[PDB]
Design an enzyme around this catalytic site. Structure first.
Site, PDB file in Angstrom:
ATOM      1  N   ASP A 138       0.823  -1.208   0.000  1.00 18.31           N
ATOM      2  CA  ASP A 138       0.000   0.000   0.000  1.00 18.31           C
ATOM      3  C   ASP A 138       0.863   1.268   0.000  1.00 18.31           C
ATOM      4  OD1 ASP A 138      -2.455   1.327  -0.100  1.00 18.31           O
ATOM      5  OD2 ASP A 138      -2.724   1.339   2.084  1.00 18.31           O
ATOM      6  N   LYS A 140       2.016   4.533  -1.272  1.00 15.26           N
ATOM      7  CA  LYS A 140       1.449   5.631  -2.054  1.00 15.26           C
ATOM      8  C   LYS A 140       1.707   6.894  -1.231  1.00 15.26           C
ATOM      9  CE  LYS A 140      -3.045   4.823   0.074  1.00 15.26           C
ATOM     10  NZ  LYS A 140      -4.453   4.416  -0.209  1.00 15.26           N
ATOM     11  N   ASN A 143       0.600   7.717   2.498  1.00 13.17           N
ATOM     12  CA  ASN A 143       1.158   6.875   3.559  1.00 13.17           C
ATOM     13  C   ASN A 143       2.636   7.201   3.787  1.00 13.17           C
ATOM     14  OD1 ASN A 143      -1.177   5.449   4.209  1.00 13.17           O
ATOM     15  ND2 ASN A 143      -0.775   3.856   2.684  1.00 13.17           N
ATOM     16  N   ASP A 160       0.775   2.916   7.974  1.00  9.74           N
ATOM     17  CA  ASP A 160      -0.343   2.086   7.534  1.00  9.74           C
ATOM     18  C   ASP A 160      -0.031   0.701   6.952  1.00  9.74           C
ATOM     19  OD1 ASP A 160      -2.846   1.202   6.889  1.00  9.74           O
ATOM     20  OD2 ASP A 160      -3.345   2.881   5.547  1.00  9.74           O
ATOM     21  N   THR A 179      -5.248   1.078  -4.155  1.00  7.70           N
ATOM     22  CA  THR A 179      -5.742   2.181  -4.965  1.00  7.70           C
ATOM     23  C   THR A 179      -5.208   2.035  -6.387  1.00  7.70           C
ATOM     24  OG1 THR A 179      -5.642   3.539  -2.966  1.00  7.70           O
ATOM     25  CG2 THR A 179      -5.941   4.688  -5.058  1.00  7.70           C
TER      26      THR A 179
END
Length: 275
Positions: A138, A140, A143, A160, A179
């Site tokens: 994750d 991105k 974060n 996260d 995402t």
């Protein structure tokens, strides 16, 4: 696993609400015994298999397990874990510097060399995670935080770990998530996943960091996914006119469909652009 059953209010003073997710809310708290500030993350339990609200105790158990293992300057650190009948509370290190990109949103526009300094910290934390066979899954912009935005050299913090996984030999992982704009084709096409996915995300991050534009973001959800899978992106002169050949090469070696031909974290650290 069994977590602390005592009331969090017995050891911390609840405060302002820092952020807020779908199945979780984070608050600013202060430990009474030391006077030190932390972040309280309340993850609502599912406690009902058929229920689509809350997080399963398998996804929670996993995130805390990863966290409890992490210990690096560029990654958020876990302090304590509590739980009651409705929530699982994670007391985490306080990261109040805000988002890296929002900080860079301040003019005096970043020099390519200065931009590398921040990316370097991101690579440092990823390097540490992959060494433990941990895929974030994750990575991105939102974060990628800063510990303190009011210092000469702000330290980036990777947060996260809700999607993080421990890549174990044998038995693959393929689930679809994340995402669209920042995920790898293997995720989009439900193919076997490993650490190569974070490397892709890193290339997306650097691309945006240097240009201010997204490489695969389309007009709709479908178009974005199609751009990713087809790995179609360009270095339009309007955004990459002041980007060196090395910076582009670095990104090209990360934005490659075949996971096995994609640069590894150790390869990125030795790339001539990173030196």
């Amino acid at each position: 696993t069994v977590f602390r059953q005592e009331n969090v209010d017995d050891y911390y003073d609840t405060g302002e609400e820092l952020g807020s997710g779908q199945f979780a809310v984070v608050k600013k708290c202060r430990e009474k015994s030391t006077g030190l500030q932390y972040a309280a993350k309340f993850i609502k339990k599912r406690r009902t298999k058929s229920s689509r609200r809350g997080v399963s105790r398998e996804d929670i158990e996993r995130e805390v397990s990863i966290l409890k293992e992490i210990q690096h300057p560029n990654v958020i650190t876990l302090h304590e874990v509590y739980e009651n009948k409705t929530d699982v509370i994670l007391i985490l290190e306080l990261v109040a510097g805000g988002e890296l990109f929002d900080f860079l949103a301040e003019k005096e526009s970043l020099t390519e060399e200065e931009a590398t300094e921040f990316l370097k910290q991101i690579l440092n934390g990823v390097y540490y995670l992959h060494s433990l066979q941990i895929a974030h899954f994750d990575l991105k912009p939102e974060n990628i935080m800063l510990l303190d935005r009011n210092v000469p050299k702000p330290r980036i913090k990777i947060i996260d770990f809700g999607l993080a996984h421990k890549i174990d030999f044998g038995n693959e992982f393929k689930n679809i998530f994340g995402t669209p704009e920042f995920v790898a084709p293997e995720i989009v096409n439900y193919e076997p996943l490993g650490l190569e996915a974070d490397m892709w995300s890193i290339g997306v991050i650097t691309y945006i960091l240097l240009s201010g534009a997204s490489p695969f973001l389309g007009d709709t959800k479908q178009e974005t996914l199609a751009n990713v899978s087809a790995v179609n992106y360009e270095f339009e002169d309007e955004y990459f006119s002041n980007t060196s050949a090395l910076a582009k090469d670095f990104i090209r070696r990360l934005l490659v469909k075949d996971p096995k031909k994609r640069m590894t974290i150790q390869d990125s650290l030795q790339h001539p652009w990173i030196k």
